[PDB]
Amino acid sequence: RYRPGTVALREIRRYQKSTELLIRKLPFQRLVREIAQDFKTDLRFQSSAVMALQEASEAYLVALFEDTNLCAIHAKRVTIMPKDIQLARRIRGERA
Amino acid sequence: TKAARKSAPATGGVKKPHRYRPGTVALREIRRYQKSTELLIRKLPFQRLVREIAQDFKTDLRFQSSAVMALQEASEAYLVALFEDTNLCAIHAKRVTIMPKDIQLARRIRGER
Amino acid sequence: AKTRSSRAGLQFPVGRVHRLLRKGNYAERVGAGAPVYLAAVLEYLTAEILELAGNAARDNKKTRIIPRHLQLAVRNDEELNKLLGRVTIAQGGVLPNIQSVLLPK
Amino acid sequence: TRSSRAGLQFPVGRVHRLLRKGNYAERVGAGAPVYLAAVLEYLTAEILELAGNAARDNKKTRIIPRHLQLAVRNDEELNKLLGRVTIAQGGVLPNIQSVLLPK
Amino acid sequence: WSPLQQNFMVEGTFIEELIKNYDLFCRRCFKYDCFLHPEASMFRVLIGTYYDNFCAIARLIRQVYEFRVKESXXXXXXXXXXXXXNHVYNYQPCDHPRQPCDSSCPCVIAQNFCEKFCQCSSECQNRFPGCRCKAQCNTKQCPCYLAVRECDPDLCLTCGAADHWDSKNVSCKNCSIQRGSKKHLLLAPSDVAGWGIFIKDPVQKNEFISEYCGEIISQDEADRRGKVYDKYMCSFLFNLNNDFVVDATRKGNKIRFANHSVNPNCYAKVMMVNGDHRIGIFAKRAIQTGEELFFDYRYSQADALKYVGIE
Amino acid sequence: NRLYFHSDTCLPLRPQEMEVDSEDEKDPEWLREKTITQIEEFSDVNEGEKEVMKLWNLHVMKHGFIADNQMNHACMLFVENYGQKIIKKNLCRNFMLHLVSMHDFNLISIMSIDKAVTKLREMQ
Amino acid sequence: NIQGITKPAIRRLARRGGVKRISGLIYEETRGVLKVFLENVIRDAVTYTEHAKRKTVTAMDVVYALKRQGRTLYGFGG
Amino acid sequence: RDNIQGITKPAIRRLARRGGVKRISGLIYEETRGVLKVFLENVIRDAVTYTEHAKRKTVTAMDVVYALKRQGRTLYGFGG
Amino acid sequence: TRKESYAIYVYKVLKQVHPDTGISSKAMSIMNSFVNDVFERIAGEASRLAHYNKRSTITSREIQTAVRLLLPGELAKHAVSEGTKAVTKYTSA
Amino acid sequence: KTRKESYAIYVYKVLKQVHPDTGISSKAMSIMNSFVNDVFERIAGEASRLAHYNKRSTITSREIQTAVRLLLPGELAKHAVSEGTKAVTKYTSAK
DNA sequence: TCATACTGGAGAATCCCGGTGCCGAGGCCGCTCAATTGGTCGTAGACAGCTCTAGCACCGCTTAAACGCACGTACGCGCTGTCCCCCGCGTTTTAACCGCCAAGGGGATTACTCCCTAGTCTCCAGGCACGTGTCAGATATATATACATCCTGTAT
DNA sequence: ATACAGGATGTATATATATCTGACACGTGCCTGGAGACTAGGGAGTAATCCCCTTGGCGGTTAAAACGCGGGGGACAGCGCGTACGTGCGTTTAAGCGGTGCTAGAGCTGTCTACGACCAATTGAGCGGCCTCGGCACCGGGATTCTCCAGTATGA
Ligand SMILES: Nc1ncnc2c1ncn2[C@@H]1O[C@H](CSCC[C@H](N)C(=O)O)[C@@H](O)[C@H]1O
Ligand SMILES: [Zn+2]
Ligand SMILES: [Zn+2]
Ligand SMILES: [Zn+2]
Ligand SMILES: [Zn+2]
Ligand SMILES: [Zn+2]
Ligand SMILES: [Zn+2]
Ligand SMILES: [Zn+2]
């Protein structure tokens, strides 16, 4: 039995080495269609556009989580909290 | 030798000077500076610093007072925004006093290097 | 109606906007309806800003609008704050905001 | 042609036509396209040199987007230039904070 | 005993040792040589105060001109100075010819504030300012109450010290000694020791009962008289300060008949009123009609004050 | 009933005879005679400078002036009450000297020197 | 729908970001932020497509929408 | 030379009071001076470049406005 | 020499919405800068759209799409309604 | 068909000139093309902004030099300026 | 004599080598259309000259803020202790993806007309600077007011 | 003998109020950019057609998702404390207003031209389609290297 924290670092290294998409295709596509249904119904999308949206969302979420980790380490703590994400989005200027 | 005197001397004492507790003057100055809109940084020292900084790129340069005033206003606004973000970060740290690590984190989150 | 703005019921100059778009090097050819649309949008925007500024001045019992009133009117709105996010105003100031944690019991 | 007259590889004619149809100005100078092509060629040469170094560092012959991401993020000037730019299939740098490390 | 409203300044082996021991105007009181403090000429006098005001220099006696041609925050700062600067001395005016009040000033030397009688600078940091109160100002917070001194009828222009004087009952309750407003007293055989004094009407706590008048004598005379007074087992001596002592035996007031009770109803204050050290007696608690007055003599040895036996 | 006594005279106080009297009034009576006999004792105080002082001292004792602002009203009362006697004894100019002194001591306004010599001489 | 982003997906996204320990109240906030971002970019793309008088959203529209928001993305012929 | 010390302690104190800071430490002045110097260097480099491109020897306000707009710090109140 | 501004039109709008209300010169310069900034943003957006659609003409449709993209929902909707009303009034006469 | 433009031939030629035994995939080629287009449009925008600021309707090599000095960091901008000056010299030598 | 630190040792996810298979890329061939060349006409811009104007050194005086020092205090950090909540693992479920096959409709392409605007010549008043009158607000003094703070009376 | 509440007291402070002025509001002249009128011609709207790019449906299987246990390290409440910051005061020191002289540089104007736009021919450098293979992906196996548990020497 491994101690807590070892598998976390191992997974960190594994996911930082590889570059595949952690989010699967169909659910993200269904979410995109549901979000686009509110603006206009009966719309069609290309697979390349869905893949590009997924890539952009994954990159944005990775950057936001890295900033949240920086904020949590600066807060003399280890566990991240929603207030860390809120402060990160406030300092970045993405929140009024 | 000594007489059986009756005496009730009360030494007494003067009143201490009126002294505010720490933190009140800070809030008073905060309200005063948030009400007013004047330039907190004075003109002559900021102008001399600007002239020294511009001397390194090219010597024998002349500047208009309007340009110096605009630079001062922009720098003051940028410093005010940075200090506000630093105060937010210090508040998130369950503390009140700001530290240089707070400014470092603020400049890191803003993406400034 | 000699002025096209009177023909459209606006106050902003259509001729000046058309000349700026021609000399602006923004495109090869310029449409006829674009300057009227742009002037109407700009007039509506400045009217909203002036309405908020007039409200703030009546809120402060004053007759002449100061840049402080403009700063308050821009920062009190949500859409204008989202629009003018990276915009600074000279002699504007900040809103009188104080956090709850610094207040005593 | 004209690229041979300057000893470059980027097309000068293509850039001149793009500047004409680019609606950036009324008239276009003659020396501007050569300058722009030279600057772009130097930039792409620097990027390709860093990518080739990273690929030799990873024992590979063909450059993958991961090599481009590593070469851009490892440099300072390229990182300052491409700050708001994301690369598909790029990845992140292997960075781990010190506080999370065990004893 | 003579009745007095104000103090009066005056300049076998037991017997063997007693024999061995033997080997113009007063601005402060506004009178002439008090007992508390130790046409040509017409024109010459008028010029000393009018300075060539012929219109008056003549009306008070051309002619005058002919004879002339012929002859030819801050308050707080002072509090800090007091802090920076139980023996008590008597106040005396200070005079600095060519300097302000400094460490060499007699006032600060004796550790006392400058009074309106001091000829020092108007803004002399050693000058004690009045109180800015709005009411009786009888609480510790009042600088005039904290400092036992009574309010001044010319500085404390808010609490009412300068108000009308006929109605002795005035707003500021820190001027009783000035007016001398004391309650009516009655002399009768004390149930404790010989004679005694009772109060006619009821009074409330910390209410000025009355002043303890008596002659002011030097410090050596204090002991000289106290020796024989102790030999009598009866003594009215009361140390006023390091400078003088109060002796009301020969002359004083009715209050002199007050006795002592370690659990008394009245207490004494050595108060500085108008630059004069005076003994006052206040109600240590609510007192009713007919009650007798007592206060702690504060003796260190119960030579004769140990009878007790009084409820 | 407790029986009370007078302090000067230890006779008992009858229930109708009381006639309330503090007998500890603002100024004692023996003091007035004391002051009169003490002023006269002064060698080198020309006859006139002996009477006006006695009159003034008696006047302030009678009214009990405490404050400086009273001294203007006090110099006015001293003529309203003692001016007739001042004229009888020909102390008018010594009373003027007194008024000048009192002004020197910063007690009275200068308009009261004139106003006083005026009031005194207006009834001459 | 919005629940298609499962808990292990956000867990892996946090492992990629360097998070060691995650609380149980982060998934809702992450879902909300992702929904806001997707709504914004989809509105922009739909506007560009409606101006083109077309009914299909291509990749160039998404590239333009990301470039306009200061999020220029490479790898699609932008 | 030494003009960097012209930003006195009370000036930064007032700037922090305006920003809402309640308590300030004694190690903030160096960091604030460094950040201000970096910002001034950036905007001055931009303005000097615009002025050299104008074939002039005097820096006007339009150049500073353009440099601030290029840095994403658009400032109003000076025209343009 | 001569130079252009927007003081007369801004003053006219102010007097139309507030007759008894003044304005200083600094606020006027601020309003002029704001108008120029909004104008240049919309012109740049229109040029980018024209280059994306391979068209060398800027009509009212491009401006409408640009104002829909640059402003938030309610503000953009109000601006679009105002622009359509102005275009109708201009095409009537 | 549509005759679209690209930069694959020139990028491949530069790569073979700096690295003969080195390949490249199509995704990296598209990334390089997008990067070249982004740098090109940024420099063109800077040149247009300078021309409009100076009230001049002509874009010469001086505007491009100032734009590349403003957009790139110090050492990179210096190297790019040296390369541009060498290219201008080689172009002005012949015609 | 108990707590702690450091070394040895048994032991599981992971790295490297060899083999096999595969599809995107570099070379190739056919194709074609926009860069190149020679030539002419036009004007945006460089150059020199003159006029004016504000940026800068200069001093002198006045003065509020900067500086240093004393004294007091309250909280950032450290330490302790106490509860608990995601992580590692195991077991059960499940739908994403892959491969394949139909089907259609909107994007791309081509040809047609057509209308609106860039252009040119002519003429006028809206807006520009310039000048001048004028009161809203800055400036200064005093007063009523709000409030932080300290001592005292009261209930347990 | 404690702890909370209430009065009052000195200190900072919104508000009346009479003055002076310079920035704000308004009159006036004149010019050039905007308005009228007519024309060519090329970009744009629309009809028609192709197809390939998108959408829809079904079978399986297997890595990913989901649920529960327990647990130990992490989150969090509470007290000591002593030091760095807040507040106040004396000192002074540098900041700010009033004018002072003036000159190098910003700005407008007359003049010439050499560099750039427009156009006819053309051809070769650049683009679409094919094709084989080897650098890279996948998989099995063995060595490698870390990762945790327990015991022994050392401090106090
Ligand atoms: N309660 C008491 N018992 C015995 N002696 C007392 C006393 N109270 C006061 N004395 C004495 O009286 C002197 C003070 S005079 C007190 C009043 C006086 N006994 C009278 O009846 O009029 C003191 O010296 C003291 O020794
Ligand atoms: Zn006296
Ligand atoms: Zn003295
Ligand atoms: Zn004195
Ligand atoms: Zn004195
Ligand atoms: Zn008082
Ligand atoms: Zn008093
Ligand atoms: Zn009083």
Question: Nearest Cα to I31, choosing from F87, A40, E223, C46?
Answer: C46
Residue E21, Ramachandran bin (φ over 0: left; ψ between -120 and 50: alpha; else beta)? alpha
Is residue C96 helix, strand or coil?
Answer: coil
CB burial of E148-175 (b: ≥16 within 10 Å; e: otherwise) equals bbbbbbebbebbbbbeebeeeebbbbbb
Q: Is residue B5 part of a domain?
A: no
The answer to whether the CB of F114 falls within 8 A of the CB of E56 is: yes
Q: How far apart are CA G53 and CA I53, in angstroms?
A: 10
Listing DSSP states for J52-90 in one string gives: HHTT--EE-HHHHHHHHHHHS-HHHHHHHHHHHHHHHHH
| Whole-angstrom distance, CA of residue H59 vs CA of residue B51 | 12
Residue H71 three-state SS? coil
Q: Which of residues 1-40 of G touch A (CB under 8 A)?
A: 1-2, 4-6, 9, 12-23, 25-26, 29-30, 33-35, 37-39
Give C105: exposed, middle or buried? Use CB within 10 Å, 0-12, 13-18, 19+.
exposed
Q: Which of F113, B53, D61, D55 is nearest to D69 (CA)?
A: D55
Structure tokens at B36: 């007013």
Contact B93 A76 (CB under 8 A): yes
Residues A2 and H26: their CA atoms lie apart, in Å, by 46
Which residues contact residue H75 at a Cβ distance below 8 angstroms, ignoring those fewer than 6 apart? B70, B73, B74, B77, C87, C88, C90, H65, H68, H69
Answer yes or no: are the C-beta atoms of E280 and E174 closer than 8 Å: no
Is B12 among the domain residues? no
Structural domain including C72 reads: 1-105
**Residue B72, domain member (yes or no):** yes
The structure was resolved to a resolution in Å of 4.4
Which candidate, E135, E175, E127, places its Cα nearest to that of E151?
E175
Task: Write out the two tokens for E11.
Answer: 């300049």
By the 8 A CB rule, do H15 and B79 touch? yes
Residue E239, both tokens: 């140390």
Q: Would you say J81 and D49 are in contact if contact means Cβ atoms under 8 Å apart?
A: no
Q: Is J29 buried (19+), middle (13-18) or exposed (0-12) by CB count in 10 A?
A: middle
CATH number of residue B107's parent domain: 1.10.20.10
Q: If DSSP codes are grouped into helix, strand and coil, which group holds residue E40? A: helix
CA atoms lying within 13 Å on the CB side of residue J68: 27
Query: CA B41: distance to chain centroid?
Result: 11
Residue B21, domain extent:
17-113
Q: For residues F41 and F30, give the distance between their C-alpha atoms in angstroms, rounded to a whole number.
A: 17
**Touching subunits for chain B (3+ Cβ pairs under 8 A):** A, C, D, E, H
Number of domains making up chain D: 1
DSSP letter for E279, please: E
Top residue of F2, F3, F7 to mutate, by most chain E CBs within 10 Å, is F7
Whether G5 contacts G31, CB under 8 Å: yes
Burial class (CB in 10 A: 0-12, 13-18, 19+), J3: exposed
Q: How far apart are CA C17 and CA C23, in angstroms?
A: 10
Report, in ranges, which bases of strand L sit under 7 Å from a protein C-beta: 7-13, 23-25, 32-36, 43-45, 53-55, 64-66, 72-76, 84-90, 94-96, 105-108, 115-117, 125-129, 135-137, 147-149
Residues with CB under 6 A from ligand 1: E 190, 192-196, 233-236, 257, 259-260, 304-305, 307
- Main-chain phi, psi angles of D59, to 5 degrees: 60, 55
Residue J8 CA, nucleotide K30 C1', distance (Å): 20
Contact, J58 vs D27, CB < 8 A?
A: yes
Tokens of F86: 């001042």
E206, F37, F90, F92, F119 from F86: Cα distances, Å: 47, 19, 6, 6, 12
Choose the closest CB to F60 out of E25, E30, E179: E30
- Tally the domains of chain B: 1
- E273 CA from centroid of ligand 6 (Å): 14
The answer to whether the CB of D5 falls within 8 A of the CB of J94 is yes
Q: E156 with E121: CB under 8 angstroms?
A: no
Q: How far apart are CA E58 and CA E49, in angstroms?
A: 13
Q: Domain limits at I47?
A: 1-93
For residue E114, the cross-strand partners are E127
DSSP 8-class letter at C104 = -
Of B88, B93, B108, the CB nearest to A70: B108
Rounded (10°) angle between helices D65-74 and D31-57: 100
Domain CATH number, residue D5? 1.10.20.10
Helix count and strand count (H, E) for chain J: 4, 2
Give the span between the Cα atoms of C3 and C39, in whole angstroms: 13
Residue ranges of domains in chain H, CATH in brackets: 1-78 (1.10.20.10)
Joined together, the tokens standing for residue B67 give: 């340009």
Window 53-92 of chain A: CB closer than 7 A to strand K: 76
| CA distances (Å), origin H73, targets B46, B67, B78, B106, D79 | 20, 15, 9, 17, 21
Residues less than 5 Å from ion ligand 6, measured at CB? E 131, 133, 137, 142, 144, 159
Residue B54 exposure: Cα atoms within 13 Å on the Cβ side: 25
Q: What CATH number does residue J51 fall under?
A: 1.10.20.10
Nearest to F83 by CA among F47, F54, F119: F119
Q: Which residues of chain I between 11 and 50 are close to nucleic strand K, CB under 7 A?
A: none
Tell me which nucleotides of strand K come within 7 A of a protein CB. Answer: 13-14, 24-26, 33-37, 44-46, 54-56, 65-67, 72-77, 85-89, 95-97, 106-109, 116-118, 125-129, 136-137, 148-152
State whether B111 and D83 contact (CB < 8 Å). Answer: yes
Q: Is residue B68 part of a domain?
A: yes
Q: How many domains are contained in chain I?
A: 1
Euclidean distance between CA atoms J65 and J53, whole angstroms: 16
Helices (H), F4-110: 29-40, 48-63, 70-88, 92-104
Distance CA H79, CA H75 (A): 9
Lookup: tokens for F46? 């020309």
Classify burial at I46, counting beta carbons within 10 Å of its beta carbon; exposed 0-12, middle 13-18, buried 19 or more: buried
What single DSSP character describes residue E291? P
Other C-beta atoms closer than 10 Å to the C-beta of F54 total 17
Taking the C-alpha atoms of residue E149 and residue E82, their distance in angstroms, rounded to an integer, is 15
Method used to determine the 3D structure: cryo-EM
